[PDB]
Design an enzyme around this catalytic site. Structure first.
Site, PDB file in Angstrom:
ATOM      1  N   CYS A   1      -0.854  17.821 -14.194  1.00  0.00           N
ATOM      2  CA  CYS A   1      -1.157  16.795 -13.197  1.00  0.00           C
ATOM      3  C   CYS A   1      -1.847  15.568 -13.791  1.00  0.00           C
ATOM      4  O   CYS A   1      -2.476  15.649 -14.845  1.00  0.00           O
ATOM      5  CB  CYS A   1      -2.044  17.378 -12.085  1.00  0.00           C
ATOM      6  SG  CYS A   1      -1.993  16.352 -10.600  1.00  0.00           S
TER       7      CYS A   1
ATOM      8  N   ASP B   1      -7.802  24.676  -4.917  1.00  0.00           N
ATOM      9  CA  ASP B   1      -8.732  24.006  -5.835  1.00  0.00           C
ATOM     10  C   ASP B   1      -9.973  24.842  -6.038  1.00  0.00           C
ATOM     11  O   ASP B   1     -10.700  25.093  -5.079  1.00  0.00           O
ATOM     12  CB  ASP B   1      -9.204  22.663  -5.271  1.00  0.00           C
ATOM     13  CG  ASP B   1      -8.089  21.687  -5.050  1.00  0.00           C
ATOM     14  OD1 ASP B   1      -7.189  21.588  -5.910  1.00  0.00           O
ATOM     15  OD2 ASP B   1      -8.129  20.996  -4.009  1.00  0.00           O
TER      16      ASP B   1
END
Length: 200
Positions: free
Chosen positions: A7, A134
């Site tokens: 990412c 997350d």
């Protein structure tokens, strides 16, 4: 086997590096992030990529999402915000985008089983195509991952990825800083991370 997403790329150069080994990548737009890029740079990365590029943002609004998608040509989005289920659903219908939604897991958890069940009802409220979790505590993640496909992220690197995968057993992993040097994706770290992750 193991979906690996790298990412927060900022250049076509970084795209080439991640394209070699990763299953997907992501560009950060319209977010308070050191990885943020202008819409033109996002457009360039998306149009040139051989792998899915997620348009990653903390945007909340249905219409700022719509405009970002139109302006970039994104086919994949990663939502890190309180954008309503209705917004996510309408973006899918109108644009045919694949939607990954991010959910925060606790740093520490008193009762893992119940925190997992709580996040699961929170998840079933949105109609996301993929769940990103997350991230310390990996117990909540383990139990969500058992019920639904998830991508797990937060502080992953070559030294911990194999262990995280053994405990959580996710559908995939997501990394940004863990494969970087001086704020740029490192080809040797990228290759190592992906290889190790793919091996477990």
């Amino acid at each position: 086997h193991m979906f690996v997403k790298i990412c927060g790329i900022k250049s076509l150069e970084e795209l080439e590096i991640v394209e070699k080994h990763a299953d997907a990548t992501g560009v950060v737009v319209n977010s308070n992030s050191k990885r943020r890029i202008p819409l033109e740079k996002a457009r360039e990365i998306i149009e040139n990529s051989a792998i899915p590029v997620f348009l990653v943002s903390t945007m909340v609004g249905f219409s700022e999402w719509a405009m970002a998608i139109e302006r970039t040509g994104a086919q994949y989005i990663q939502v890190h915000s309180n954008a309503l289920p209705q917004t996510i659903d309408t973006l899918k219908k109108e644009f045919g985008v694949f939607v990954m939604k991010a959910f925060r897991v606790p740093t520490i958890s008193k009762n893992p089983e119940e925190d997992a069940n709580r996040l699961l009802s929170e998840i079933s409220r949105y109609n996301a195509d993929m769940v990103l979790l997350d991230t310390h505590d990996l117990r909540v993640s383990s139990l969500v991952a058992r019920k639904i496909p998830v991508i797990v992220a937060g502080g992953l690197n070559a030294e911990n990825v194999e262990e995280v995968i053994k405990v959580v057993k996710p559908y995939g992993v997501d990394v940004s800083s863990g494969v970087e040097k001086y704020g740029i994706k490192d080809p040797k770290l990228v290759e190592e991370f992906v290889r190790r992750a793919k091996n477990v």
